[PDB]
Structure formats: structure tokens, C-alpha cells
Design a protein around this ligand. Sequence first.
Ligand SMILES: O=C(CN1CC[NH2+]CC1)N1CCCCC1
Ligand SMILES: [Zn+2]
Length: 106
Amino acid sequence: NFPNSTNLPRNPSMADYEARIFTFGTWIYSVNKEQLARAGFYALGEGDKVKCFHCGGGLTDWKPSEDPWEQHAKWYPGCKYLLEQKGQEYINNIHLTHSLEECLVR
Ligand SMILES: O=C(CN1CC[NH2+]CC1)N1CCCCC1
Ligand SMILES: [Zn+2]
């Protein structure tokens, strides 16, 4: 299913931070859940799979080193929530970084 790039969220029931934070429960995984919720992610109950309330973007198999906002921007750069909370400059920083990380090896 394609990512949502409209200014309207795909899952408006998860639009409030408090709604999202309730989805995790006891969270054993490597990335802090409050951080995941602030980046707009709620939990699916399927290991450490999160989905963005706005773009619907899904992310799984999180490493301890990884940042929710960075991961959000890498995989779901079209997201209007991300663009609202972080601004296009941040997004360009993140993408230049990830594209330069890729090239410093491949
Ligand atoms: O899991 C990912 C990408 N990363 C893997 C490492 N941990 C953070 C997310 N996705 C799944 C959905 C399609 C794009 C790739
Ligand atoms: Zn999003």
C-alpha cells in the first residue's frame, strides 16, 4: 500500500501522542517508545513493528543505534507530519547523510 503524502492523516485515531503511547504496553525492544510515539509511531503488536499515524509508513527490526525521526525520514520522506514537525532542511540533512553513508562503502 502506497505511502500517504496528503496533509490529512491516514489513521486519525492515533493522532494524539497519548493514543499512540498506549499501543506499546511493556516494550522490550531497542528503541525507546516515547521517542517512537513523538515521531508519530504507534505499535502493531507484531514484534517491534511500528506504523506512522499520518503516512501509514511501517518500520520493523529496529537496532539500538537507530533514531525514529531519522528512520521516518529515510523510508517515508513524503510524510506531511514529518515535514510539519521537522522542516524540509532537517529532511535534506538526513537524506544527504544516508545517501553519503551508502556511497562511503558502495
Ligand atoms: O524495516 C524497514 C527499514 N528499517 C530496518 C531497520 N530498522 C528500522 C526500519 N522497512 C520495512 C518497511 C519497508 C521499508 C523497510
Ligand atoms: Zn509519517
